[PDB]
Amino acid sequence: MKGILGTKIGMTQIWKNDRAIPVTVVLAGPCPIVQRKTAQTDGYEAVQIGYAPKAERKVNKPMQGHFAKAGVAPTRILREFRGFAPDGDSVNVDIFAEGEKIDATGTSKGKGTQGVMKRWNFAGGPASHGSKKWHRRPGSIGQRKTPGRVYKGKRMAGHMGMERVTVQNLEVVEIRAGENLILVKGAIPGANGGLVVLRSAAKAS
Template sequence: MASWSCRFLLQRGSRVISLRAAAESPAHVVSCIRTVKTTTWFDEHLTEDNQEYMRKSMAQEYRRQTVDKLNPLKDEPWQRHDWTQGSRRVGLVAVKLGMAPVWTKAGERHVVTMLQVQDCHVIRHLSKEEYNGHTAVLVVGGKNVSPFHRSEEQMEMFRNAGVPPKHKVTTFKVSDNAVIKPGTPLYAAHFRPGQYVDVTAKSIGKGFQGVMKRYGFKGQPATHGQTKTHRRPGASGPGGDPAKVFKGKKMPGMMGNIFVTAYGLKIWRVNTKYNVLYVNGSVPGHRNCVLKVKIIIFRHTCEVFFS
């Protein structure tokens, strides 16, 4: 008697079951099950109504924690210190909105990038002894996200600070007289027009690119005996004694998708109503990306070279 087989393949993301049975022995069944790992910490078998109820309950809980943490009657604020020469202040976590032109009173046109500060809070303070023994650190987070995609360790840190979960969490080195209490909100008014900042973000990924696009090589001639080498780099290493290609040689490869810092960007305007910073020129990253903004230390150097 001829044997027969049956296979069931469900949609992507569900279980894949392979069944094979022989006609002469119907009881012989071989199954292979691949489980799917969920990205949430709650049970994957909950219904949609239960999941929606949990999301609403968690939102109300974090809203209550934020209100209780900002109540000045329950906890005394930290002592404020005066600014001194060499003080290092904390930075911000902002979202890139896009670019736009602005004009000065003298009629000069400048292209700026708009950075919006969304739900930026101080999360944690690390003293010199806890960090590296040299400088203190403030942990800052920005842009609220759903708590269902964060680990329990991260959620514990946010609960201790009394703030909702954040999309991006970064550190800023600060001086002893610039320490801020955890749970304090930060706004665009933290900076003033005329200051210079450094902006760090992940650049836009370009994929695998050649040397002309990646490093700006001139390329080879279009005619006069050149065949299929118009966009190639040419000779890649010396012959004779070295007879090798040195490390760090500029060659084709993956371009972008790395953290890049734009230094010495001047702040032209601060919109306190919508918490928007207008910084000079372009900044790395795509639109709606979350980036790190920190005040520059060498102010006089920026005024000379970037003005």
């Protein structure tokens, strides 16, 4: 249910009581409501809010129409959340309480194309026992004539990164509302200045 948008600002050291907590600083700036999707409107229950501000001079006629219909003023980013309401618009105030466990989604830093070691954790090869250009390669890719083919899904070199990743049960250390900042324990995927969606827990714990 609960959810909001913001940007990953960075990681830092703070102390609650006497242990050094590592904290990721998130800015969940205010989100306007824009679209409210219901059953008889769209089939399914959801709300579409928006995050980063955007000047008119950069906004499509159709997009302007969109935003204008709910009179909101325009945003570089829209996203949906299944099963959500209140009224007005949405700041991380109230929406999160300190101590509450949340789920943080982002887009992992992308690594480009990566061999089987870096990508999958292959074992590599003998750096020295006569190994002949087989230091980093993935060994064998199959059996023999049964089944004369290569398994579908077989892990091998490829585009590692730039993927959507959700970390579960991160703990809301601090909330400075009206700076729209959530101090969150641990680590969120994706680089500084990246987009993150924060959510209630998926799990009860």
